[PDB]
């Protein structure tokens, strides 16, 4: 259970941004998370089926079906020493994201106060504590955030979904830093200025053309985009909740290669990648929210 | 589609349609398509009517295909449109292309808005036109008692000093005296007296 790691932002800066996105994103998902430190990949992992502590009352009063299911590699961090008898000395965890998120928003404003102090995380011994320390630049910050071990039994029942590929359209989504992205978002977060929209109706028509219709208002609105749009690999169409698409627009707003993955009436997949260089995919399952 | 219209200057329809909330805020608005324009006519209680005309002249393409029927008449309700055009003029600073589309009698009336990256479209549902009709409420062109031609903006300030002095009850005099004199006059009724 001799889990150690250390965190440097200066040296690389996409790994943090990379790290900051799970962290933000799963605490506003919903609350606590699961850590799955294996031997080469991290795992954080937020899903209503499980989380021990955060099964409580998810797909039961507010239809949060919605899985995250990230992967961070070892290279990201600067010493990867995971010591566990599990298989792949597998480590799984659960704390909340409250306190790691501050701990996080603490450290990036020491960092943004001039300071080249490192992070360095430990397992201080089925319920132990994440051992957060840091410095400025000799004022000492030390954080005792609670954690559990989850056991592997537990761990097993985890198991992300698996998406068929029978009607399944990818969709290029085009990066924020290119011309059409800053127009693309804007696009995304159109959705957003009417505060009585609940469920989103996405259409992919196959050059593909994108396309978010709304029908609960007294008028009926069609959000189209004319712009281009490539299909990396019919009207594939998939009714959605608001939320899902907001995390949604956070995610492409954080990252580049972004895959918009469309089940027919089933799912819809939101893949976000950084290509690094293994590849820090990032990964949001979300369910149909009513039938076409 | 039986009628398409495009433009670019969507102040002007704004303004067009600022023009007809006076005339109540939330009740049907009659369109009328034809050849030469399009035309907004709103009713109130019997008693007033107005009739605003964009002529064809103010877009760009105005095909109107209808061929069975000279004249096109769809009702539709104004907050409708008024709470739809309201969100979507929240970046009225881009290049905005308006068009407008209607395909018949049953069909929606349609408002694209494209910005060369978005295109929003707005579907209106139409509703069954009622008994009134607008041309009893005009006025018999045989029988003017008197016709005087004045500015806007000293009518426009005649009009909000009215409105500032209350007005319940307004008066129109208009005499032409025999040397060159004209008088014309706005009295009111109000609080002060």
Known sequence: MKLKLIVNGCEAPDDYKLLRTTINTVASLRKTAILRFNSERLTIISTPKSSLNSSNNGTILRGDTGQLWCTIPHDVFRLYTVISARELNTITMECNCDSLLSVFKRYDRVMNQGSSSNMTIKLQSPICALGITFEEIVIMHSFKVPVKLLFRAQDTRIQEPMINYIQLMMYKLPPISGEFGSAFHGFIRRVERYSNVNHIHLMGVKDVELKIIVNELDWHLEICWNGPLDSVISTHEVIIRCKDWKVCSKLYAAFEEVVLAISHDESCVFHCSLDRGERGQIIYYIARSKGL | ?193
Do not use: W
């Not at chain 2, 000093?161 to 209350?166: F, R, V």
């Open chain 2, 1 to 193: 589609n039986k009628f398409s219209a495009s433009t670019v200057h969507l102040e002007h329809i704004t303004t067009a349609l600022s023009c007809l909330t006076p005339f109540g805020s939330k009740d049907d608005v009659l369109i009328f398509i034809d050849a030469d324009g399009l035309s907004f006519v709103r009713e109130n209680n019997h008693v007033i009517k107005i009739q605003l005309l964009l002529s064809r002249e103010l877009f760009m393409s105005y095909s109107y295909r209808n061929e069975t029927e000279d004249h096109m008449k769809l009702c539709v309700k104004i907050n409708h449109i008024l709470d739809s055009v309201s969100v979507m003029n929240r970046n009225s600073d881009d290049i905005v292309e308006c068009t407008l589309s209607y395909d018949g009698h049953g069909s929606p009336f349609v408002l694209i808005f494209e910005d060369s990256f978005i295109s929003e479209r707005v579907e209106y549902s139409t509703y069954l036109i009622k008994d009134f009709d607008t041309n009893g409420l005009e006025l018999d062109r045989e029988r003017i008692s008197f016709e005087a031609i004045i500015k806007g903006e000293a009518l426009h300030s005649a009009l909000k000093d009215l409105k500032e002095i209350g007005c319940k009850e307004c008066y129109v005099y208009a005499k032409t005296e025999a040397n060159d004199e004209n008088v014309f006059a706005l009295i009111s009724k109000s609080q002060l007296g």
